[PDB]
Design an enzyme around this catalytic site. Structure first.
Site, short mmCIF file in Angstrom:
data_model
loop_
_atom_site.label_atom_id
_atom_site.label_comp_id
_atom_site.label_asym_id
_atom_site.label_seq_id
_atom_site.Cartn_x
_atom_site.Cartn_y
_atom_site.Cartn_z
CE1 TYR A 17 0.91 1.77 4.14
CE2 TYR A 17 1.50 -0.55 4.16
CZ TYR A 17 1.63 0.71 4.69
OH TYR A 17 2.48 0.90 5.75
CG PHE A 22 0.98 9.13 5.50
CD1 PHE A 22 0.63 7.86 5.94
CD2 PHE A 22 0.00 9.94 4.95
CE1 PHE A 22 -0.66 7.40 5.83
CE2 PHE A 22 -1.31 9.49 4.84
CZ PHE A 22 -1.64 8.21 5.28
CG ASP A 23 3.59 3.65 6.23
OD1 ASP A 23 4.83 3.59 6.10
OD2 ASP A 23 2.94 2.87 6.97
CB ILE A 36 -7.29 2.85 10.40
CG1 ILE A 36 -7.17 2.52 8.90
CG2 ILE A 36 -5.99 3.47 10.92
CD1 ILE A 36 -6.88 3.69 8.01
CE1 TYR A 62 -3.71 6.19 10.75
CE2 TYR A 62 -2.87 5.67 12.95
CZ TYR A 62 -2.93 5.41 11.58
OH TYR A 62 -2.22 4.36 11.06
CG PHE A 79 -5.09 4.28 2.77
CD1 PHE A 79 -6.03 4.81 3.65
CD2 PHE A 79 -3.77 4.16 3.20
CE1 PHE A 79 -5.66 5.22 4.95
CE2 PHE A 79 -3.39 4.57 4.50
CZ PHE A 79 -4.34 5.10 5.37
#
Length: 357
Positions: A17, A22-23, A36, A62, A79
């Site tokens: 993913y 950010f990731d 999440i 979050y 995402f």
């Protein structure tokens, strides 16, 4: 959670993913708060190998706390997710019982061995349905109701109101014997759908007083033996084990209880040794004999049994003695010659290999 282009609760998922505001293989369990809400809700809708996009609101990510520095406070995350593969949860890290949760249950507890449970049971073999009923029974003794040991074992890890599918490998289904009344051939793989409706736990050992432990020991020594005669050794082991469990550590007992307690143990230990012999589980045999001996160091059955088992484990020396000690008290000799014969054969074999290797 908006989506754009199937794993079950508790399945092991593998994905790739990227998440932007950010990731960037990430493996976690679905249905557990490990990721999440958006993901648990999303991933749950992907077919293997598919890729999707998800616009997730804070309410599903979050939230207002965010994850500083990276994820801001009211962040709505985007995402791109790739479901590589996924599998059921292996209840005993051996592939014997694969579970896949259909509906989470509720509760601080789980059925224990000895617990009475009431379940809905649907079971098939090779696609064919051979069982669809509501059943009340005792965990560890489902054999009494035509239920394979796998269900009793799985139940110890389920909650009230939980519904799951359980895949039982040969070692947890009906076994070598098969199950004629169901048209189930030897060592067949089975699939069951189980719903735990209710259950009452059996008392833990420490919760029964001496008197009760001794009444129940008599009841289960008997129940063990019935199973033993019927060739249901696994069920016997379970029944005799309660005795070792309920008494092996007791003390402060009265001479009258102490003798009865001892008597029970020694027998439960000699019966298990015999049980484990049938189950070809030698190390267990030797252990049960060991205990037996620790009580009655000059026990005939004890020593013989320790012997049959040690021989079967190629422990010729140790075995030679056990039978000898058997003789120093009261088939032993034929077995005695057997050890020597088999020990010789064993070293020729050991020397041949080493040489060949």
């Amino acid at each position: 959670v908006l989506k754009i282009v199937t794993p079950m609760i508790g399945d092991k998922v593998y994905v790739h993913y990227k998440g932007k505001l950010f990731d960037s293989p990430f493996v976690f369990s679905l249905g557990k708060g490990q990721v999440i809400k958006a993901w648990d809700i999303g991933v749950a809708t992907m077919k293997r190998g598919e890729i999707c996009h998800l616009l997730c609101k804070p309410e599903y990510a979050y939230g207002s706390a965010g994850s500083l520095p990276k994820i801001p406070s009211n962040a709505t995350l985007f995402f791109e997710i790739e479901l590589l593969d996924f599998k059921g949860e292996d209840l005993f890290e051996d592939g014997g019982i694969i579970r896949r949760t259909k509906r989470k249950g509720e509760g601080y507890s789980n059925p224990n061995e000895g617990a009475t449970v009431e379940i809905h049971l649907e079971g098939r073999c090779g696609g064919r349905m051979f069982d669809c009923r509501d059943v009340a029974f005792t965990v560890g003794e489902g054999e009494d109701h035509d239920i394979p040991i796998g269900i009793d074992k799985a139940l110890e890890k389920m909650q009230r109101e939980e519904q799951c599918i359980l895949y039982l490998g040969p070692r947890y289904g009906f076994g070598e014997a098969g199950k004629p009344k169901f048209g189930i051939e030897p060592n067949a793989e089975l699939i069951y759908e189980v719903t735990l409706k209710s259950f009452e736990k059996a008392k833990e050992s420490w919760e029964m007083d001496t008197k009760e432990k001794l009444e129940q020991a008599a009841i289960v020594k008997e129940k063990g033996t019935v199973y033993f005669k019927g060739g249901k050794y696994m069920q016997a082991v379970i029944q005799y084990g309660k005795i070792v469990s309920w008494l092996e550590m007791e003390y402060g007992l009265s001479e009258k209880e102490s003798k009865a307690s001892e008597s029970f143990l020694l027998a439960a230990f000699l019966n298990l040794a015999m049980c484990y012999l049938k189950l070809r589980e030698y190390t267990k045999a030797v252990e049960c004999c060991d205990k037996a001996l620790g009580l009655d160091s000059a026990n005939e059955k004890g020593l013989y049994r320790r012997g049959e088992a040690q021989l079967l484990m190629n422990e010729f020396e140790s075995a030679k003695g056990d039978f000898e000690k058997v003789l120093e008290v009261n088939a032993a000799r034929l077995q005695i010659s057997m050890c020597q014969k088999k020990a010789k054969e064993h070293n020729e074999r050991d020397r041949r290999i080493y040489a060949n290797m």
